[PDB]
């Protein structure tokens, strides 16, 4: 667990989690409960903040760049599946802005 990775866990994930718009990204999209029976055929690599958080907490990542790619996948999946004025896209967009600002302050490995 590099210090960039502990920053992803202690700073990026924590800051995003507390956001009022973050909760649709806490858990995998459940295509049955939400009646999106095409979701897994369009979105081949599902990702969510809960899975990212678990991977950080259990030292799954080899580098912070893998963690960031999961974040990038999470947001991009949202945009792939949804429409530009959907509430979910506005929520993703607000979260993504904070994400970009927070990883800009990520410390260097030393």
């Amino acid at each position: 667990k590099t210090n960039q990775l502990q920053y992803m866990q202690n700073v990026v994930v924590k800051t995003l989690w507390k956001h009022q718009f973050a909760w649709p990204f806490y858990q995998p999209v459940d295509a049955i409960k939400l009646n999106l029976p095409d979701y897994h055929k369009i979105i081949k690599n599902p990702m969510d903040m809960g899975t990212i958080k678990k991977r950080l907490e259990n030292n799954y990542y080899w580098s912070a760049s893998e963690c960031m790619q999961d974040f990038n996948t999470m947001f991009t999946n949202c945009y792939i599946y949804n429409k530009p004025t959907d509430d979910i896209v506005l929520m993703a967009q607000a979260l993504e802005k904070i994400f970009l600002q927070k990883v800009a302050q990520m410390p260097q490995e030393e």
């Binding site: 649709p24 939400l34 999106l36 599946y81 949804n82 429409k83 959907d86 509430d87 979910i88 929520m91």
Partner: peptide
């Protein structure tokens, strides 16, 4: 998709 999440 997903409706009105506000």
């Amino acid at each position: 998709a997903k409706g009105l999440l506000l």
